[model samples]
Target: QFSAEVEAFIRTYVKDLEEGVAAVFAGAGLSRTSGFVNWSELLREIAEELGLSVELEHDLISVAQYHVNKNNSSTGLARKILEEFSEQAEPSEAHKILARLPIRTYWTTNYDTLIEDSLKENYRVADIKRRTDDLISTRPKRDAVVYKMHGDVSSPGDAILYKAQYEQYYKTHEGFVTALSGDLISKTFLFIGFSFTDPNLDYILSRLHVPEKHRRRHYCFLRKEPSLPQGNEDEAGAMYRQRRQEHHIRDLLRFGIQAVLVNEYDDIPLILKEIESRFLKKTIFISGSAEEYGAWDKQEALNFVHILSSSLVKNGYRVVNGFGWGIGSAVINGALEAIYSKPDKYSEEQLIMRPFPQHSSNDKALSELWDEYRQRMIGLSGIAIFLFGNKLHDGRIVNADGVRREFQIAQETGVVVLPLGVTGYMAKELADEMLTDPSKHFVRYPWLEKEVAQLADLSANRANIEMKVLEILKKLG
Candidate 1:
C-alpha cells in the first residue's frame, strides 16, 4: 500500500492528460512553498482589527470582512492584497513540473500570478479568465485555459475576499459557476496541496449534487496531521487525530474524490515525479543532424538511425522527429517500418514528424520563427536523444548551432537529455560537457560514467555502441 493509490492515480491521470481532458485544481499551499503566504498568513495582520489573536482565527474570509467593516470600504484590503502578492517569486519545483505537463485546464482559488506565469515560462500562452466577460473573449494561439475562480491580484478590488462576495457568488458569477460545473463533470481534476479547511471547499462541493453515475472521480493530496508536540495527552490525542482524518477521507469519497494520505507533505512531489516518469517513458524526441559522419560512412549512419528509430516505436515509445538533415529521412524510414509492420499494434500517433521549412515568410523573420518552432517541437517530448550534429556551414562541416540551441531549451524545460557521444560532432561536445559536470545535467544513472566513457571511444564497434545507448535508455526506465 506504499504507492497503491498513487499508482492508480497516475495510470488514469496519464490517460486523461494525453487525451487533453485532465485539469489541475491548485490551492494556496502549492504557492506557499514559493515564498507566498497562504490564506491564514495573509489575514493574520487583519485579525488584530477585531481584537482577536491570529492563532484563534480560522474563518479568514470573516476576518477580511471585519477589516472592511472597520474601514467602511475595501480599499485598504485591496492595497494589502496587491502589496502581498505583487512582488514576483520564483516558481516551485511542483509549479515547474505541472507547467511542462500536457494539461490544458487549470483551476485555482489563489490570487497569485504563479499559474499563468509558469505556463508562459514554458512557452504556453495562458488563456486567463477571472470575470464573466473574460470568458467570452479569446486569445490567438492560446495553449491552456486558466480559470481563476477567485479574482486575480492584478485587480484586487474585485477579488473574492470577504464574506459578502462568497454569499453573493451564485447571483453575480453564475457563468463561472456554470463553467466550473461543466469541467467538473467532463474532465478529471487533480486537487493538489489543499489544506481541506478552506471555506470555499464546502461551497464548491455542495453545488456538485449530480447523480453518482454522472460524476467523475477526482483526486486530492492530503498530509496526515501530526500529533501534539509535547508528551501531554500523547497516544490518546494521536489516536483521535487519526480517526478524524479517516472520517474526512471517507467523506471525500462520497463526493467522488480519492484522498491520497501521505506521512509528510514532501511526499507530494515524489508522487508527482512518478507521474512524470510514467508520462515520459511513453514519448521520446530525437535531436540529431548530420552533414558528414565522422567515424562511419553515410550508409552506416543512416542504418543506425533507421534501426533505432524503428526499435523505439516497437518498444512502445512515441517518436517525435524534427526532420534533421541526413538523419531525418532515416528516422522516418525506421518509424514507418514499425508502424506498418503491425498496423493494429502501432498507429500514426506513434510517429510525429515536422520538417523544418527551407523558405522564409513575410510575417516573421527566419531566425525568430526557427526559435519558436524549435521550442514548440521540443515541448512535446519528455526525453531528448542527441545523435550526430554537424552542418555544412562556410563550406565545412561544423557542429550545428540548431542542435545546441535545442539542447539549451530542453535543459531549461526539464527534458531528460541523452547525448550519443560516440556518434561524434556536436553531440560529442555535449557529452563532454555533461561528463565534466554530471550534476549540471541530471541524476547520473548507475555505471553512467563507465557507459559514456565507452561511448566516447571511437574504436568502439557501431553494434556495441548501439547496444550501450539502448542500455542507458533502459536504465532511465
Candidate 2:
C-alpha cells in the first residue's frame, strides 16, 4: 500500500513517461550494490590523508577540497578514485529497471558506468554527456542520454570534487546547468537513490529563472525515519531526526519536489513495479481479421466486436486496432459511441488505429514494412485480445499469417495474451496451443480450463461467449 499523495505522484509521472518527458536523477545509493562507496566512505580515506578521521568530519566536500589544497593538485584524489572505481561492475537492479523504462534523459552524480552499461544490456545506445561539449552532437539512433554532472570516473582528474570546482561549476559546466534547468522546467523528474546532501539539485533549481509557481512538479523518494528508539539513539534523537527530515521535505516542496516516504529502501522497487503495471493495464490491443464468420453470422460477429470494443473503452482501457478487414469499422464505431457517451472520461487517444501500409520505401520491401508495422503496433500494446483471424484471398478464407506473426511477437515481448477461442479461426488455434501445455507456461487462470473448453465448443451461443470474455476482462481490472 502507498499514500494518496504517492499514488497521485505516480499518475503524473506515468503520464509524463508516456509523453517522453520523464527523467531519472540518480545518486550514489543507486550504485552501492555495484561495489561503489557512498560519499562518506569515499571521503574517509581522503580525510585520513588530511590528518583527520572521517568520523569527526561533518563537511565531506570540504575534505575533498582540502585534499586538493594540501597536495596543490588533484593527483591524490585521482588516485583514490581510480583505486576505488576503476574496475567495471554489474549494474544494480534499480539501474536495470530504469534502463528498461522508456526514459530518454538520465542525470546522475555517479561517476561509474553502470547506467550506461545497463542501457547497453537493454540494447540501447546511450549518448553519454560528461562535459559541456558532449551535448552539442548526439549519437545516431541513440535511445537515451546520460548526463554525468560530476564528470566520469575515466577522467577522475576532471571530476567535480573540490570546493573550487563546485564554485566554478556554473562557469565551466554552464551548458549542463542550463540544460538541467530547462529540463526541470519542462519534464517530470524522479529523484531516486539520493540523500539531498548533494549540491546538484539546489544549484540547478536555484538557477532556474522561472518563478516557483511556474516550475514543473517533480518527485523524490525518502525513507521515513522510525519513531522508536534504536542502538544509536533515544526517543528524543529519533524525534529530532524525523523533524529535520520533515523540514527538508517542506523546503523541497518550495522547489516543487514532492517526497514519497517509504519505511525501507526495498520498497522502492515495489513502488516502481506498481507504477509500470498500472500504466500497462491502461492499454489493451484488439487483434482480429475476419472475412467470413462461421457459426455466428457476419452481423452477429460485427455486433459482438462493437460491443466488446465499446465495453473496453468505457472501462477506461485504451484500444489499439489494426484496421483489420470486416472488423475495424465496427471497432471504431463502438469506441466512438463510448467516447461520445462521456467525453470527460474518454479521449480519441484511447483509440489507436494503424492500418497496414499500402506501399514501402526504397530501403524496405512491402512485406518487410508490413512486418515492421505489426512489430510497432504490438510493441505499443501491453495486453492483446485475439478474435477471428481469417482473410479473404483468391475467393477462399485463409488464416491470416499476419495475425499469427503478431501473436508471436506479442508473446515474445511479454504481452498478456487473451485469445477468444469461441471466435474461431486463428484465435481458436492459439487458445488450443495455450491449453495444450498450460503447465509449460505460467498461465494464471488454469482453473478456467472448462471455460476455455466451452469457448471452443461450436454449440456455445454468442451471448455465452461474450459473457466468458467479459469475466476474463473483469478479472484484469
Candidate 3:
C-alpha cells in the first residue's frame, strides 16, 4: 500500500542519508518528460518508424536492439534517446527534485544531459576518464560529477553498443562499475523512470553480481495497477498480473536487491524535504519508557535518545539533544548529514552547533564547534530543543523574559520552536516567583493534555514530547 506510512519510510531514509556516501545514479525513465519513449515504447517506436517488422515475444526488446545495433552502437541509440528528451526544458520531477538534494556523483546508462542540465548548478559535468585524468587534478572538489556511461546525447552512435562493445567497455570501465556497485552496496537507491521494457534494466543489475553481504538494497517505484502509471493501489492482483508483478518486484529485489519497496517516484522529493527538516533543533525528545520505543535493553537509558530520535524522525521534525550522552555530538551529526545529502542544494554555510567553549569545560573542542554551529542552527528554518539541556546554557537566562529576548527575531520569522523536558517545572516556578512582577504568560502548551486534571499536564513533560512539538510547529512550521 502506498499509504502515508510508506511516505514516512521514504522520508526517514532520506533523512538518514549522511552526506556523500555513494554517488547518485540516474536512468532513462528519469528523462521521460524530455520525450524519450520508455523501454517498450521506445523499441516499438523504433521498429515502426525505422520501417521494420513487429511482434517480438516480449514486445520490442530484441527487435529494437537488433535494429539499433545493426545500424550503429547502442550508445548511439542512447544518445538519440537523450536528445529527444532534452529539448527546451521538459526536465522530469525526478531530475528537478534530485537537483534539490545533496547528490554529488551521478552515473547513467543513457547519455542524456537532462539530469546534468537540471542539476548543473549544483553538480558539475565531467567525463570519466580516470585512467587518463585524475579527479584532484581536474576539479575534485566540484559540487557533483555526471558520468555518461554509454555516452552523452550529443555523441550519437558513440555510446556503448554490441555485446563485444559492452564487454570491452565494462572491462575498461571497471572504475565506473566499481563506483556504481559500491553505491548500490552502501546507499539506499531510489530508481525512477524505469521503462519496464528495457534490456539494460535486466543486464546492468544482473551483471553487478551483488554478493549477499555487499549488496545494498534499493527501490523502484511502479504502478500497482498496470493501468495506473505509478503504483498507488494496494489491492490484490489476479493470478496472471500478480505473478508478473511479483516476478518484477522479485527481480528488483534480486537485481537492485532492495530490501525495501516503494510504489511512486513522486514521493521521493517530498520525503527529502521532510527528512531535511529532522536535521534541526526544533522538535525535542524527552526520553520516555521502553514500551513506547519497543526496546528491552538494560542499556535502554543510554540508547533512549537515539530510539526516540528514530521515532521522531519517522514522523517528521528534527531533534536537538543536550542530555544523558553526547547530545551536542548528535546535533552536529545531523548537521553534517545536511552537508552532503543536500549537496550544492544550498550556497549558505549550512551547518552549526551550540555552547561556546572558553578556557574551561565550555572552551573544549566540542564547545568551540558549538559556538560556531549554534549561530548557524539558529538562523535555520526552525529549532527543536529539549528544556532539560537549558542548565548548560544557564538556568537564569532561560526565563520568560529571556525567551522573549532570544526568540523574538526567530519567532517573528515564523521559526518553528519546540521545547520539551523539565521546562514546565521552570515555567511553574518562575510564574510563582514573579507573582508581583506582573508579566503575561504565553500559553506554552497550545492545548491541555487530556489527563491534565490528574497531573499539572506537565505541559512540557516527557510523555507529551511529540505532542507539544507538533503543537508548537502548528503555529510555525
Pairs that clash in candidate 1? none
lDDT of each: 0.78, 0.77, 0.47
lDDT of 2: 0.77
Model 2 deviation from the true structure expressed as Cα RMSD, one decimal place: 8.1
Clash count, one per candidate: 0, 0, 27
What is residue 437's positional error in candidate 3, in angstroms?
24
Across 167-260, the per-residue lDDT of candidate 1 in tens digits comes to 8988888878888888888999888757656646776666555577779999888887776634465788878877788888888887788887
When 1 and 3 are scored with lDDT, the better candidate is: 1
Give me the candidate number with maximum lDDT.
1
The TM-score, computed over Cα atoms with residue i paired to residue i, of candidate 3 is 0.53
Q: Candidate 1: deviation at residue 123, Å?
A: 0.7
Backbone clashes counted, model 2: 0
lDDT of 2 by residue, 209-244 (tens): 556666887888887878897769988998998888
Local accuracy of candidate 3 as per-residue lDDT tens digits, 1-477: 236655665554554444445345566656665423445544555676556644453645455566666776454454344455445335665566565455556667766566666655433444342231332255644556666766655655455544455656667666667666666676766655554556556556655667787776565555452433334444343445545767776766666444233344555544445554443333442211111111222343224344444444444444433322233443445544544455565322333223333344444575455444333334343543432222223534332332322233334433433333233323233323323232322233333222222222343235544454454455443
Looking at model 2, which ten-residue stretch has the lowest summed lDDT? Answer: 81-90
